């Protein structure tokens, strides 16, 4: 028998969401805040179909810490659900949602990408404009003030600049332009904006330290940031209390700092977790580093890693997708297998009742293969 | 003989009690170390916190995802749990899975400790106040917005003896020995009581108190509760879930007397995430606000915008109450300890259990079955 293709995986703080072929969205892990979208508030230790979105032709899903977002191109609709405080759902109120509701303000808009932080969200349009909503106490919305926004608003600072992709951490935000410029704004106290100081910004400010390179992508962890250049070089900045910047030490960096141990690899995907980091090379090799108390790094132990270590998979099958949560990691491989590792107490690994795992464990429910090495 | 429960405190998803015989017990969510047992696992039943055996603890106080306790004889304050923004006070941001002394407070005579989400405060016997932790909205009251990893004195209170303090998500309140009421920190929902929605970086005196002196204050997540010298209860700040208890859902920017309780004398108050509890001088406990998980304890799952009495078997008098984010704890005159509301992290302490919408006895700590 054949499973559905996993088109997209996204990890939240304690939950996990996936879009499968056949217009099917499934969610598992912590459900207490309505982030799973199954109507109730219970955790689900196994991938569970999100009926509410059946036949809504969803094209992508993105998790925030304790909420989830999804959008449909054909429907021209963005849906949101979960913890609602500070307007992170963008419905013009602070109500939690335990089932998906469309973001009226985004109806009819052509969405290119969506990013979710802890308490704020951003959407990039096909034209390259950006709209943001949610908590704004430190300027993370990039609107020039510090007032929360319960509805999406355009970032006027970016007019005339085509944005390629955006990313969001706990309370900071980053972006890269089509022509390769890197921006940061929001809470900046650990150097995570990349601007060379520890001060907040209320509008996007361009990062002028990029190793002389244009930047193709950016990702945010909780209080650290990661970017990849046009040459596939990897840069990290912000907090490194747990070694999550990956430079072989525990020092913060206030400007982008090239990760020299990966200088001979081309990075194709990046993801930032609460206190850990993942980077995926063009040859499908996954590297992880940072906090590993619960084994979220995936290297077979529970010791923190301040330098990149290759995460190994059965038969060295290549990885094609990776997403970091707060205490867990998810990955999709070339064989249409899904793996999870790290903390399992909210069911976020999706493998039925389970202890925590410190190396990749297959999610049989979503995978072609069965358990290996048995 | 069941040890008497002396003090109960509820965190966001955890529960902590001080028992006679100098032992601390903790249960509920354990993932951030807030239980203090060294591991990171939830405990469905009250579990003795061995590291504090024989430390002569006199009080415990829960923040959202951390816990504080102090000893008079040892002149020591301890903290453990989620460490971010310096909420534990040890000069760093490290989580702690077992209690450690807050060195900065070593030898200080402690009158009271309050814990919010990400910041804490200690009042000294002399009425001075020290604060530490997150400060992005001025909640430490130090006149800036820089987080502090160690306790710092609130100089704004020099010459003003503080009686008691309280801490919400990112706001703080206090009452003075003379009965003046103060507010500071994040103020966006009117929860400072100052008549507006602006933050304050230093304490500001509440000037509209119905011409009354205040003896107590407590903070919920984004609301604030105070009690006057005449036992009158006032609430202010957020009432989206009816947590202010006035019968409507409008926010109040200044303290507002809860008229339904005007004939009662309130002896104890507690603010939860989105609900509230008030205990009368004659042992009647009233709850109100958000009730999705049954945390109001009225035997149902509907929100309650006016105070409703929490019923116990035979109307046995309640002597103590403490609100969590989705649960509530109480102790009664019969030395029973009840818990209700959300149970998924084990916070009710009744062993593996679903949620409860009316008080359930904690057999491990209680006389009655």
Show me where the domains of chain A are located: 1-374
Q: What is the DSSP letter of B256?
A: E
* Burial class, B315, CB count within 10 angstroms (exposed 0-12 / middle 13-18 / buried 19+): exposed
Alpha-carbon gap, residue B239 to A79, rounded angstroms:
27
Q: What DSSP character marks residue A141?
A: T
Cβ-Cβ contacts under 8 Å, A343 against chain B = 31
B29, closest residue in chain A (CA to CA): A345
Contact B308, B286 (CB under 8 A): yes
Nearest Cβ partner for A345 among B31, B188, B240:
B31
> B136 and A94 in contact by Cβ < 8 A?
no
The C-alpha atoms of residue A36 and residue A53 are separated, in whole angstroms, by: 12
Instruction: Decide if A42 and B344 are in contact by the 8 Å CB cutoff.
Output: yes
Tell me which chain B residues have a C-beta less than 8 angstroms from the C-beta of A187: 136
- The shortest C-alpha distance from B313 to chain A (Å) reads 29
Shortest CA gap A178–chain B (Å): 33
Q: Which two tokens stand for residue B289?
A: 């606000």
Which tokens go with B329? 């704890």
Cα gap B322→A35, rounded to integer Å: 27
CB pairs below 8 Å between A and B: how many?
24
DSSP letter at B76 equals E
d(CA A192, CA A252): 9
B215: left (phi over 0), alpha (psi -120 to 50) or beta: alpha
Q: How far apart are CA A42 and CA B343, in angstroms?
A: 11
- CATH architecture of residue range(s) B1-369: 7 Propeller (2.130)
Domain A1-374 has CATH 2.130.10.30: yes
- How far is Cα A168 from Cα B135, in angstroms, rounded to an integer? 22
Tell which of B13, B82, B84 to mutate to test the A interface (max A CBs under 10 Å): B84
Resolution in A for the shown PDB structure? 1.8
Q: Which chain B residue lies closest to A240 (C-alpha atoms)?
A: B93
Evaluate whether A215 touches A176 at the Cβ level (below 8 Å).
Answer: yes
Q: How many Å lie between the alpha carbon of A231 and the closest alpha carbon of chain B?
A: 36
Which among B31, B136, B188 is the nearest to A138, CB-wise? B136
Number of Cβ atoms within 10 Å of the Cβ of B208: 14
Q: Which of B93, B186, B344 sits opposite A241 (nearest CB)?
A: B93
**Joined tokens for residue A222:** 């909780």
Give dist(CA B177, CA B172) in Å, integer: 17
Mark yes or no for CB contact B186/A343 under 8 Å: no
In B, which residues are within 8 Å of A189 by CB distance?
Answer: 146-147
> What tokens does A340 get?
């999870």
Q: Is B147's CB within 8 Å of A241's CB?
A: no
- Chain A CB contacts of B326 under 8 Å are 32
Q: Which of A94, A137, A343 lies nearest to residue B137, judging by beta carbons?
A: A137
The residue ranges of DSSP E strands in B95-147, in sequence order, are: 96-101, 110-115, 119-124, 129-133
- For residue A95, give how far its alpha carbon lies from the nearest alpha carbon of chain B (Å): 9
| Burial A138-166, CB ≥16 within 10 A → b, else e | bbbbbbeebebbbbbbebebbeebebbbb
User: How far is C-alpha A201 from the geometric centre of its chain's CA atoms?
Assistant: 22
The tokens of B53 are what? 């055996």
Residue B258 to chain A, least CA–CA distance (Å): 25
Residues of chain B with Cβ-Cβ distance to A327 below 8 Å are: 31
The C-alpha angle A328, A330, A336, rounded to 5 degrees, equals 160
User: Least CB-CB distance to A137: which of B41, B136, B344?
Assistant: B136
Distance from CA of A302 to the nearest CA of B (A): 13
Identify all chain B residues contacting A293, using CB atoms and an 8 Å cutoff: 40
CA A141 to chain centre: 17
Interface residues of chain B, partner chain A, Cβ below 8 Å: 31, 40-42, 93, 136-137, 146-147, 186, 188, 240, 292-293, 326, 342, 344
The phi and psi torsions of B250 (rounded to 5 degrees) equal -90, 145
Phi-psi region of B343 (alpha: psi -120 to 50; beta: other; left: phi over 0): alpha
Cα distances (Å, whole numbers) of residue B10 to A96, A337, A343, B35, B312 = 23, 42, 25, 11, 19
> Can you tell me the distance from the alpha carbon of A227 to that of A300, in angstroms, rounded to the nearest whole number?
27
Which residue of chain B has the CA closest to A355? Answer: B41
Q: Which residues of A touch B (CB under 8 A)?
A: 32, 41-43, 94, 137-138, 148, 187, 189, 241, 293-294, 327, 343, 345
Q: What is the dihedral sign for C-alpha A43, A49, A51, A57?
A: positive
Phi first, then psi, for residue A17 (nearest 5°) are -130, 145
Q: Which two tokens stand for residue A62?
A: 């993105």
End-to-end CA distance of chain A: 21
> With contact defined as beta carbons under 8 Å apart, do B11 and B67 qualify?
yes
């Amino acid at each position: 028998a054949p499973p559905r293709k996993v088109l997209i995986i996204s990890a939240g703080a304690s939950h996990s969401v996936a879009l499968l072929s056949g217009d099917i969205v499934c969610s598992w892990g912590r459900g207490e805040d309505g982030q799973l979208g199954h109507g109730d508030a219970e955790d689900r230790p196994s991938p569970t179909q999100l009926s509410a979105l059946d036949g809504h032709q969803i094209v992508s899903v993105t998790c925030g810490a304790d909420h989830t977002v999804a959008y449909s191109q054909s429907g021209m609709e963005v849906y949101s659900w979960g913890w609602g405080d500070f307007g992170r759902l963008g419905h013009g109120n602070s109500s939690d949602l335990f089932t998906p509701l469309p973001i009226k303000a985004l109806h009819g808009i052509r969405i290119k990408q969506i990013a979710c932080g802890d308490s704020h969200c951003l959407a990039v349009t096909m034209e390259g404009e950006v709209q943001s909503w949610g908590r704004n106490q430190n300027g993370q919305l990039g609107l020039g003030d510090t007032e929360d926004s319960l509805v999406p608003q355009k970032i006027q600072a970016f007019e005339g600049i085509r944005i390629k992709m955006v990313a969001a951490g706990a309370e900071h935000t980053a972006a890269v332009t089509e022509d390769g410029d890197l921006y940061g704004w929001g809470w900046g106290r650990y150097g995570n904006l990349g601007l060379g100081d520890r001060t907040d910004r209320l509008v996007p400010e361009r990062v002028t330290s990029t190793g002389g390179e244009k930047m193709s992508m950016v990702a945010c962890g909780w209080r650290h940031t990661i970017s990849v250049s046009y040459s596939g070089a990897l840069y990290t900045y912000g907090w490194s209390k747990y070694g999550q910047l990956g430079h072989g030490d525990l020092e913060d960096h206030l400007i982008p700092h090239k990760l020299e141990a990966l200088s001979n690899s081309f990075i194709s995907q990046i993801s930032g977790g609460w206190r850990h980091t993942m980077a995926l090379t063009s040859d499908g090799k996954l590297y992880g580093w940072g906090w590993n108390k619960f084994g979220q790094v995936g290297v077979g132990n529970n010791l923190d890693q301040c330098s990149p270590v290759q995460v190994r998979f059965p038969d060295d099958q290549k990885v094609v997708q990776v997403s970091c949560g707060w205490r867990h990691t998810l990955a999709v491989t070339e064989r249409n297998n899904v793996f999870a590792w790290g903390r399992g107490t909210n069911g976020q690994l999706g493998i039925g009742e389970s202890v925590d795992r410190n190396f990749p464990k297959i999610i049989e429910a979503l995978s072609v293969d069965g358990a290996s090495g048995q």
